[PDB]
Design a protein around this ligand. Structure first.
Ligand SMILES: *[C@@H]1O[C@H](CO)[C@@H](O[C@@H]2O[C@H](CO)[C@@H](O[C@@H]3O[C@H](CO)[C@@H](O)[C@H](O)[C@@H]3O)[C@H](O)[C@H]2NC(C)=O)[C@H](O[C@@H]2O[C@@H](C)[C@@H](O)[C@@H](O)[C@@H]2O)[C@H]1NC(C)=O
Ligand SMILES: *[C@@H]1O[C@H](CO)[C@@H](O[C@@H]2O[C@H](CO)[C@@H](O[C@@H]3O[C@H](CO)[C@@H](O)[C@H](O)[C@@H]3O)[C@H](O)[C@H]2NC(C)=O)[C@H](O[C@@H]2O[C@@H](C)[C@@H](O)[C@@H](O)[C@@H]2O)[C@H]1NC(C)=O
Ligand SMILES: *[C@@H]1O[C@H](CO)[C@@H](O[C@@H]2O[C@H](CO)[C@@H](O)[C@H](O)[C@H]2NC(C)=O)[C@H](O[C@@H]2O[C@@H](C)[C@@H](O)[C@@H](O)[C@@H]2O)[C@H]1NC(C)=O
Ligand SMILES: *[C@@H]1O[C@H](CO)[C@@H](O[C@H]2O[C@H](CO)[C@@H](O)[C@H](O)[C@H]2NC(C)=O)[C@H](O[C@@H]2O[C@@H](C)[C@@H](O)[C@@H](O)[C@@H]2O)[C@H]1NC(C)=O
Ligand SMILES: OC[C@H]1O[C@H](O[C@@H]2[C@@H](O)[C@@H](O)O[C@H](CO)[C@@H]2O)[C@H](O)[C@@H](O)[C@H]1O
Ligand SMILES: OC[C@H]1O[C@H](O[C@@H]2[C@@H](O)[C@@H](O)O[C@H](CO)[C@@H]2O)[C@H](O)[C@@H](O)[C@H]1O
Ligand SMILES: [Ca+2]
Ligand SMILES: [Ca+2]
Ligand SMILES: [Mn+2]
Ligand SMILES: [Mn+2]
Lengths: 237, 237
């Protein structure tokens, strides 16, 4: 069948969401993935937000895989240009009941200790050793070393519209990033076999992180706000 | 091996373009694919515009296929809502030195008594027998019976931004359609093996058509204007 939900905005204490670590919902309705005190983003922050109920992406009985579409708006404000904002945010799919991973360039979804599979779309703002120039969009499968990336220029503090679509029949994951105020459009796509990397049931959500203390730079930070979010999935099984 | 060009606007008899049939460039810089007299689009019109120089999409020696990206803005104004606007416009790739094909639902790129291969992205406004609900975006390979389609709502007379990207390593052709004034975003993608359908050298361009006389409806028309166009291709050969 078809599952779906839509958050035109976030109401404090959402029954539908699971907030982890620093993730909070502000009084004015936005989902702040990372810590922001008195209007200022801090470093050493990591937070995630998961849809409370698990979604079935595939069925072992029929062998069918779900197709899905998710749309959301986010905003990244980088108050301090030098030396380097960090780290970025991702939309991810992972097994249910996982714990926040390592922060920094791992966005809180990768745990070197005990790794769990995941498919994520990253909006990377800090160039780690494994990264190409930033900012860039990346498609991540079980790792933060993207299978494909594309550069983009951030609209600092502006709103961004993202469209992520997965077509099971072609196994194509296509993502579109648009900054309405600048009129710019970025597109990236890759082939991903969900059935091969993920279990039948998963959690969908966001995760973000600011500068890791090991970098010794308190300015390595920015906001990671989610303004709205809609999700739809169809499993003919 | 990189080839690219950019047209922020179009000038009268540009050396870089090959205009065919009704295609003409207006005094105010727009590329009008189909006939418009005294601000009114007419039926029974067909026109194409090709980049004057051929581009190499693949090399028989190395076996490599080119990756490319093209961006353009177009506008479709439909003055007569009833009974039905027609027919639409396409961005296409075909062998060099082709002639305008049949008009109507064939957009001027398909010639029944001398079919040549082609890959095209259509913005279809008239529902032929082989079509799903209109308007819709479609990916066409050697035929106007799309391999994939997606519906969209036209911003009548408004501007549309299109991004077409082809990644040779994955064979994915992804297209994004955005109507800035409405803030709507449409995305479609499919797998296409250029090397399998097209020759090493091709022409890239646009083609459009208005109502065919056989429909006996003079209102079966609309404008098909191209405002800007940039193209880039890389052959690692
Ligand atoms: C960490 O991030 C902070 C906040 O941006 C940086 O501090 C700021 O450094 C600016 C230097 O580009 C200062 O700008 C000056 O502003 C005044 C008035 O606004 C002008 O007259 C002058 O020409 C400059 O444009 C800005 O005042 C300062 N902000 C504050 C209140 O601290 C900081 O920069 C670096 O460290 C600070 C402590 C100073 O030593 C700066 O000179 C230095 O660039 C960022 N730190 C890092 C690691 O780069
Ligand atoms: C072909 O396209 C023309 C142009 O739109 C159609 O004629 C137009 O028909 C409209 C009927 O829907 C007329 O609209 C009405 O206009 C008056 C005053 O302008 C308003 O008060 C009223 O609220 C409607 O908006 C429109 O005036 C007319 N345009 C002109 C100047 O001719 C045409 O429709 C066909 O002919 C007209 C004259 C009527 O007989 C219609 O019933 C008839 O369908 C379109 N023809 C086809 C094949 O549909
Ligand atoms: C649709 O437009 C065509 C123009 O490309 C018309 O054909 C052209 O008509 C010219 C004068 O009518 C003639 O000099 C051209 O040789 C001819 N070109 C072609 C494609 O052969 C076409 O038909 C014309 O108009 C209709 C009404 C009849 O009068 C025909 O005898 C004309 O050729 C136009 N179709 C219709 C039905 O309007
Ligand atoms: C980065 O953020 C951490 C929060 O997770 C800070 O440590 C806190 O959490 C750890 C384990 O989760 C606890 O053991 C600490 O008691 C917590 N500290 C606080 C603020 O109450 C962490 O702070 C640093 O490390 C901890 C272990 C203490 O030594 C703090 O004094 C120290 O500042 C913070 N890192 C930095 C450098 O800001
Ligand atoms: O400053 C923020 C960043 O901190 C870390 O980056 C590394 C750091 O671990 C250390 O190896 O030193 C180098 C510079 O020599 C970098 O700062 C995180 O790994 C980054 O993701 C980022 O948070
Ligand atoms: O009226 C515009 C359309 O005219 C033609 O469509 C067909 C027509 O040829 C004839 O077969 O009758 C049917 C309806 O019974 C349609 O009108 C073109 O083929 C279309 O592309 C369009 O121009
Ligand atoms: Ca990074
Ligand atoms: Ca059609
Ligand atoms: Mn990255
Ligand atoms: Mn069609």
């Amino acid at each position: 069948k078809t599952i779906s939900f839509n958050f035109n905005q976030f109401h404090q204490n959402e029954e539908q969401l699971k907030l982890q670590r620093d993730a909070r919902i502000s009084s004015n309705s936005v989902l702040e993935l990372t810590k922001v005190v008195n209007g200022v983003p801090t470093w050493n922050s990591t937070g995630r937000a998961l849809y409370a109920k698990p979604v079935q992406v595939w069925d072992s009985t029929t062998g069918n895989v779900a197709s899905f579409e998710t749309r959301f708006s986010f905003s990244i404000r980088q108050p301090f240009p030098r030396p380097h904002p960090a780290d970025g945010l991702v939309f991810f799919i992972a097994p249910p009941n996982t714990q926040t991973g390592e922060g920094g360039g791992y966005f809180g979804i990768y745990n070197p200790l005990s790794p769990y599979p995941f498919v994520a779309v990253e909006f990377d703002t800090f160039r780690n050793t494994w990264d190409p120039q930033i900012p860039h969009i990346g498609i991540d499968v079980n790792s933060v070393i993207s299978t494909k990336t594309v550069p983009f220029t951030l609209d600092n503090g502006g709103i961004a519209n993202v469209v992520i679509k997965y077509d099971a029949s072609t196994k194509i994951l296509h993502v579109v990033l648009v900054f309405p105020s600048l009129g710019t459009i970025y597109t990236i796509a890759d082939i991903v076999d969900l059935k091969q990397v993920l279990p039948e049931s998963v959690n969908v959500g966001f995760s973000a992180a600011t500068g890791d203390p090991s970098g010794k730079q308190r300015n390595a930070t920015e906001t990671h706000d989610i303004l709205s979010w809609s999700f739809s999935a169809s499993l003919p099984g």
